[PDB]
Motif scaffolding. Structure first.
Motif, PDB file in Angstrom:
ATOM      1  N   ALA A 203       0.426   2.731  12.799  1.00 45.29           N
ATOM      2  CA  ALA A 203       0.542   1.477  13.543  1.00 45.29           C
ATOM      3  C   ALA A 203       0.020   0.287  12.759  1.00 45.29           C
ATOM      4  O   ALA A 203      -0.900   0.410  11.948  1.00 45.29           O
ATOM      5  CB  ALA A 203      -0.201   1.574  14.875  1.00 45.29           C
ATOM      6  N   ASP A 204       0.623  -0.871  13.018  1.00 46.45           N
ATOM      7  CA  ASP A 204       0.004  -2.145  12.703  1.00 46.45           C
ATOM      8  C   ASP A 204      -1.089  -2.310  13.755  1.00 46.45           C
ATOM      9  O   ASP A 204      -0.790  -2.389  14.955  1.00 46.45           O
ATOM     10  CB  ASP A 204       1.049  -3.269  12.799  1.00 46.45           C
ATOM     11  N   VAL A 205      -2.352  -2.343  13.308  1.00 44.80           N
ATOM     12  CA  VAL A 205      -3.498  -2.419  14.228  1.00 44.80           C
ATOM     13  C   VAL A 205      -3.438  -3.635  15.169  1.00 44.80           C
ATOM     14  O   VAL A 205      -3.901  -3.557  16.309  1.00 44.80           O
ATOM     15  CB  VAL A 205      -4.873  -2.318  13.500  1.00 44.80           C
TER      16      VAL A 205
ATOM     17  N   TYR B 297       0.829  -1.210   0.000  1.00 46.48           N
ATOM     18  CA  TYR B 297       0.000   0.000   0.000  1.00 46.48           C
ATOM     19  C   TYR B 297       0.872   1.271   0.000  1.00 46.48           C
ATOM     20  O   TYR B 297       0.427   2.350   0.422  1.00 46.48           O
ATOM     21  CB  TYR B 297      -0.959  -0.006   1.202  1.00 46.48           C
TER      22      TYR B 297
ATOM     23  N   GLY C 163      -7.551   1.130   9.420  1.00 41.16           N
ATOM     24  CA  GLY C 163      -7.125   0.884   8.047  1.00 41.16           C
ATOM     25  C   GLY C 163      -7.744   1.939   7.156  1.00 41.16           C
ATOM     26  O   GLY C 163      -8.481   1.621   6.228  1.00 41.16           O
ATOM     27  N   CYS C 164      -7.418   3.197   7.443  1.00 37.92           N
ATOM     28  CA  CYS C 164      -8.098   4.352   6.857  1.00 37.92           C
ATOM     29  C   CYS C 164      -7.699   4.666   5.403  1.00 37.92           C
ATOM     30  O   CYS C 164      -8.287   5.556   4.784  1.00 37.92           O
ATOM     31  CB  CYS C 164      -7.883   5.580   7.748  1.00 37.92           C
ATOM     32  N   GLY C 165      -6.709   3.947   4.868  1.00 39.50           N
ATOM     33  CA  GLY C 165      -6.283   4.123   3.474  1.00 39.50           C
ATOM     34  C   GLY C 165      -5.800   5.536   3.236  1.00 39.50           C
ATOM     35  O   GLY C 165      -5.044   6.073   4.048  1.00 39.50           O
TER      36      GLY C 165
ATOM     37  N   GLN D 297     -10.401   3.176  -1.709  1.00 44.26           N
ATOM     38  CA  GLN D 297      -9.995   1.846  -2.166  1.00 44.26           C
ATOM     39  C   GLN D 297     -10.883   0.814  -1.499  1.00 44.26           C
ATOM     40  O   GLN D 297     -10.447  -0.013  -0.694  1.00 44.26           O
ATOM     41  CB  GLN D 297      -8.518   1.607  -1.869  1.00 44.26           C
ATOM     42  N   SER D 298     -12.162   0.917  -1.829  1.00 45.95           N
ATOM     43  CA  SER D 298     -13.207   0.088  -1.270  1.00 45.95           C
ATOM     44  C   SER D 298     -14.428   0.350  -2.122  1.00 45.95           C
ATOM     45  O   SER D 298     -14.466   1.337  -2.875  1.00 45.95           O
ATOM     46  CB  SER D 298     -13.485   0.452   0.195  1.00 45.95           C
TER      47      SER D 298
ATOM     48  N   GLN E   3       0.403   6.745   3.402  1.00 45.95           N
ATOM     49  CA  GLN E   3      -1.001   7.053   3.663  1.00 45.95           C
ATOM     50  C   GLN E   3      -1.169   8.105   4.757  1.00 45.95           C
ATOM     51  O   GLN E   3      -1.924   9.057   4.567  1.00 45.95           O
ATOM     52  CB  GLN E   3      -1.784   5.789   3.998  1.00 45.95           C
TER      53      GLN E   3
ATOM     54  N   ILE F 237     -13.442  -0.266   7.361  1.00 49.60           N
ATOM     55  CA  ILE F 237     -13.969  -0.346   5.990  1.00 49.60           C
ATOM     56  C   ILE F 237     -13.012  -1.164   5.139  1.00 49.60           C
ATOM     57  O   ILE F 237     -11.931  -0.703   4.767  1.00 49.60           O
ATOM     58  CB  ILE F 237     -14.216   1.049   5.332  1.00 49.60           C
ATOM     59  N   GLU F 238     -13.427  -2.389   4.845  1.00 49.70           N
ATOM     60  CA  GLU F 238     -12.656  -3.305   4.001  1.00 49.70           C
ATOM     61  C   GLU F 238     -11.191  -3.487   4.437  1.00 49.70           C
ATOM     62  O   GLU F 238     -10.260  -3.512   3.618  1.00 49.70           O
ATOM     63  CB  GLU F 238     -12.849  -2.950   2.515  1.00 49.70           C
ATOM     64  N   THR F 239     -11.029  -3.602   5.756  1.00 52.06           N
ATOM     65  CA  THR F 239      -9.749  -3.837   6.412  1.00 52.06           C
ATOM     66  C   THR F 239      -9.737  -5.224   7.068  1.00 52.06           C
ATOM     67  O   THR F 239      -8.699  -5.871   7.111  1.00 52.06           O
ATOM     68  CB  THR F 239      -9.435  -2.702   7.420  1.00 52.06           C
TER      69      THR F 239
ATOM     70  N   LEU G  86      -6.212   5.270  11.465  1.00 53.42           N
ATOM     71  CA  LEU G  86      -5.116   4.391  11.818  1.00 53.42           C
ATOM     72  C   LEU G  86      -4.720   3.611  10.571  1.00 53.42           C
ATOM     73  O   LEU G  86      -5.549   2.969   9.926  1.00 53.42           O
ATOM     74  CB  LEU G  86      -5.490   3.454  12.978  1.00 53.42           C
ATOM     75  N   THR G  87      -3.438   3.684  10.241  1.00 51.78           N
ATOM     76  CA  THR G  87      -2.896   2.975   9.083  1.00 51.78           C
ATOM     77  C   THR G  87      -1.479   2.510   9.372  1.00 51.78           C
ATOM     78  O   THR G  87      -0.777   3.107  10.187  1.00 51.78           O
ATOM     79  CB  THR G  87      -2.920   3.832   7.794  1.00 51.78           C
ATOM     80  N   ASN G  88      -1.079   1.432   8.702  1.00 56.17           N
ATOM     81  CA  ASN G  88       0.279   0.916   8.816  1.00 56.17           C
ATOM     82  C   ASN G  88       1.209   1.487   7.740  1.00 56.17           C
ATOM     83  O   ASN G  88       2.379   1.112   7.660  1.00 56.17           O
ATOM     84  CB  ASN G  88       0.280  -0.626   8.808  1.00 56.17           C
TER      85      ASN G  88
HETATM   86  N1  LIG Z   1      -2.382  -4.728  10.274  1.00 49.49           N
HETATM   87  C1  LIG Z   1      -2.788  -3.530   9.792  1.00 49.49           C
HETATM   88  N2  LIG Z   1      -2.728  -2.403  10.546  1.00 49.49           N
HETATM   89  C2  LIG Z   1      -3.134  -1.197  10.092  1.00 49.49           C
HETATM   90  N3  LIG Z   1      -3.625  -1.022   8.848  1.00 49.49           N
HETATM   91  C3  LIG Z   1      -3.732  -2.072   7.987  1.00 49.49           C
HETATM   92  C4  LIG Z   1      -3.315  -3.419   8.414  1.00 49.49           C
HETATM   93  N4  LIG Z   1      -3.530  -4.253   7.379  1.00 49.49           N
HETATM   94  C5  LIG Z   1      -4.046  -3.506   6.370  1.00 49.49           C
HETATM   95  N5  LIG Z   1      -4.155  -2.213   6.741  1.00 49.49           N
HETATM   96  C6  LIG Z   1      -4.678  -1.080   5.952  1.00 49.49           C
HETATM   97  O1  LIG Z   1      -6.066  -1.286   5.684  1.00 49.49           O
HETATM   98  C7  LIG Z   1      -6.373  -0.725   4.411  1.00 49.49           C
HETATM   99  C8  LIG Z   1      -7.298  -1.645   3.623  1.00 49.49           C
HETATM  100  S1  LIG Z   1      -7.829  -0.814   2.160  1.00 49.49           S
HETATM  101  C9  LIG Z   1      -9.246   0.077   2.716  1.00 49.49           C
HETATM  102  C10 LIG Z   1      -8.817   1.530   2.890  1.00 49.49           C
HETATM  103  C11 LIG Z   1      -9.921   2.495   3.330  1.00 49.49           C
HETATM  104  N6  LIG Z   1     -10.623   1.980   4.551  1.00 49.49           N
HETATM  105  C12 LIG Z   1     -10.890   2.718   2.201  1.00 49.49           C
HETATM  106  O2  LIG Z   1     -12.064   2.382   2.323  1.00 49.49           O
HETATM  107  O3  LIG Z   1     -10.543   3.232   1.133  1.00 49.49           O
HETATM  108  C13 LIG Z   1      -5.058  -0.474   3.683  1.00 49.49           C
HETATM  109  O4  LIG Z   1      -4.982   0.919   3.374  1.00 49.49           O
HETATM  110  C14 LIG Z   1      -3.956  -0.893   4.631  1.00 49.49           C
HETATM  111  O5  LIG Z   1      -2.944   0.115   4.756  1.00 49.49           O
END
Ligand SMILES: Nc1ncnc2c1ncn2[C@@H]1O[C@H](CSCC[C@H](N)C(=O)O)[C@@H](O)[C@H]1O
Ligand SMILES: Nc1ncnc2c1ncn2[C@@H]1O[C@H](CSCC[C@H](N)C(=O)O)[C@@H](O)[C@H]1O
Ligand SMILES: C[N@@+]12CCc3cc4c(cc3[C@@H]1Cc1ccc3c(c1C2)OCO3)OCO4
Ligand SMILES: C[N@@+]12CCc3cc4c(cc3[C@@H]1Cc1ccc3c(c1C2)OCO3)OCO4
Lengths: 341, 341
Positions: free
Chosen positions: A169-171, A64, A120-122, A81-82, A148, A186-188, A142-144
């Protein structure tokens, strides 16, 4: 008979036409449907529960970081990205992103003044949407991904938003005593190796007044890892590495209520996702020359650029076949609202 | 055009042949399927969740006292009044009752030494089964029927079982600090006006080590009250009074995890229930003269006797059509295993 490498070679050289490409991927998903559907509901539940139980045993044990300029050339305005939501045949990707953000706000019962966490806010479309619409909300993404985080902070600055922060952070590793009125995912969750522990962790970031909203790609009937069934499937492992992505059934998360309790449950028909990936594919095709130029300094060679582009384009082509299958009534988007136990 | 009273008159006079009777009832259930199935999963979940939410709003606000001799003439050896399990085409109702009891013991993880509560224990087949098989278990049946309590106690005495007690109580009103290792609810939850409060109450009778096993008649896809859709349905209100019986979807109880947490989930194909009601109907027909004689002193007139018999027989005829519909793949039996929160 033809090998994986043979089909992959032709794909990377742009020798498979869109018609054949779609046909091949549709067939692959067709075989997934044959694999997932059982003759009786008795057998269907046996199959589904075996899958659910296996996920709970995973308690024992994608990149990502692409440039923002490229992502801007392929995705909509907020680089969502969802799955988006399309009211009309003429709804643009920009309008669909906004409609999807509004849908999340409605269903997650977002109100001005709330503390909001987006996991996983993208590229932060939803974070920025809520921050702009609800000035008294404090919104945390929150994003890894460093890229982003940096994109979101820059956008918040440009949009004169003072109510945004981003946790890098890694969630699954993030430790905090902080709680939030609203948690959005959202799609995380499709990327989560350990769902039971994930839901448990989320519940510790909630109070009695909090709500948790989860949106995930699903199949309406069964769950599956996004992986090859057989040697004929060149597609799945090309799109995602092994063990990266799980496609839960539309009801799978109902079995993960150890620490959270369901309040509502919806699905959004797959045609919305289909129209989303179609819009991305078309925009990438329109901005092809520009995309190639953007990617060249960061990657090294035109061949490495073609590789990233083919990966994203095939994702969209394949996604179209997956989500449009039987007019959106196979793979779709599930949404769930939870409170804390 | 014909009225309810016209069809009801002919039914009570034995003027509707079995072929026409089955045909009429099958059509009624066919219309229920049309009512319950929605065009998209999006709409299906909207429909299903509306039903679930309405059940949670019921937090704001049949005659099981028939003579034992009659019930003995119609039902199997242990007078089981719930879906049985048939291994073979030649499996008898007695064998099917035992197989069903064994199935419950396996799925509820019954072990010798446990305290066991059976909620809505009926004529106590399961209570007596567990008490006999597991001599160190203490098994409690709970029923709101004096006749049922008395039958169970007599049977326990005849079977030299010293590990049985029966609580005479309305389960919704019963107050106790007592807890049990295993709580079983076999086709009793369909009678519960308030499910959320029922599950809450059950959880207070559990410890951290307890399991709760629920078996209920279901439809695989949607929930419905067992009631007439329209004026053409003479059947549903004849079988059960208004508001007596709810047919939950196979997944409805997954939305009732406020106080208990799901561990496993099964369905048993409807042909088992179909074979159960068929066996009861056939046994009642074989013992028709005897049944009439048994019922006469308790009821008063041959007409009042014919009324009770027609009610039970039509229940079986109708049940056959309901549960055999699409080879058992519409209405069936759902089973769920829960632990305490
Ligand atoms: N272990 C983890 N910790 C934090 N973020 C993570 C993760 N594994 C995946 N992600 C994040 O989760 C996202 C999934 S994509 C969805 C992105 C956003 N919610 C949207 O709707 O557009 C990616 O951007 C990725 O960076
Ligand atoms: N509120 C209530 N309290 C206690 N028992 C109830 C009840 N409502 C219904 N019941 C009992 O629940 C039973 C449902 S019939 C199922 C009986 C038994 N479990 C079997 O499998 O054969 C009836 O026998 C009825 O007496
Ligand atoms: C968030 N998601 C995580 C898991 C996942 C998995 C998918 C999918 C979309 C998705 C979503 C949406 C999406 C859109 C565009 C993307 C992308 C993803 C991955 O990764 C790079 O570009 O379609 C088929 O399988
Ligand atoms: C337990 N159940 C409670 C709710 C319910 C509801 C039903 C059903 C069976 C039953 C069972 C099973 C049974 C079997 C025989 C009976 C009976 C019931 C009612 O009542 C009188 O005789 O078939 C169609 O709808």
């Amino acid at each position: 008979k033809e090998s994986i490498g043979e089909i992959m070679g032709k794909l990377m050289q742009g020798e498979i036409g869109d018609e054949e490409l779609s046909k091949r991927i549709k067939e692959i998903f067709g075989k997934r449907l044959q694999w997932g559907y059982k003759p009786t509901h008795q057998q269907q539940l046996a199959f589904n529960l075996d899958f659910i139980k296996s996920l709970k045993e995973m308690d024992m044990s994608e990149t990502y970081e692409l440039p923002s300029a490229f992502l801007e050339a392929a995705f909509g305005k907020t680089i969502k990205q969802s799955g988006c939501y399309f009211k009309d045949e003429t709804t643009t990707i920009d309008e669909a992103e906004e409609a999807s953000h509004e849908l999340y706000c409605e269903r997650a019962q977002i109100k001005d003044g709330q503390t909001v966490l987006d996991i996983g806010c993208g590229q932060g479309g939803l974070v920025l949407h809520i921050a702009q619409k609800y000035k008294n909300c404090h919104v945390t993404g929150l994003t890894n991904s460093k890229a982003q985080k940096n994109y979101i902070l820059m956008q918040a600055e440009k949009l004169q938003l003072s109510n945004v922060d981003v946790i890098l952070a890694d969630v699954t590793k993030h430790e905090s005593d902080k709680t939030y009125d609203r948690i959005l995912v959202i799609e995380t969750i499709e990327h989560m190796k350990n769902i039971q522990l994930f839901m448990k962790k989320l519940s510790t970031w909630m109070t009695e007044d909090s709500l948790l909203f989860v949106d995930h790609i699903c199949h309406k009937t069964f769950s599956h890892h996004f992986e090859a069934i057989d040697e004929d499937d060149w597609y799945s492992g090309f799109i995602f590495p092994k063990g990266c992505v799980t496609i839960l059934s539309a009801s799978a998360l109902l079995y993960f209520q150890d620490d959270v309790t369901i309040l509502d449950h919806w699905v959004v028909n797959g045609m919305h996702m289909a129209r989303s990936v179609d819009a991305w594919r078309k925009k990438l095709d329109k901005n092809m020359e520009l995309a190639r130029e953007i990617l060249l300094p960061g990657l090294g060679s035109k061949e490495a650029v073609n590789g990233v582009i083919t990966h994203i384009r095939t994702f969209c082509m394949g996604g179209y076949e997956q989500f449009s299958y039987n007019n959106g009534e196979e793979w779709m988007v599930a949404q769930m609202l939870f409170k804390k136990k």
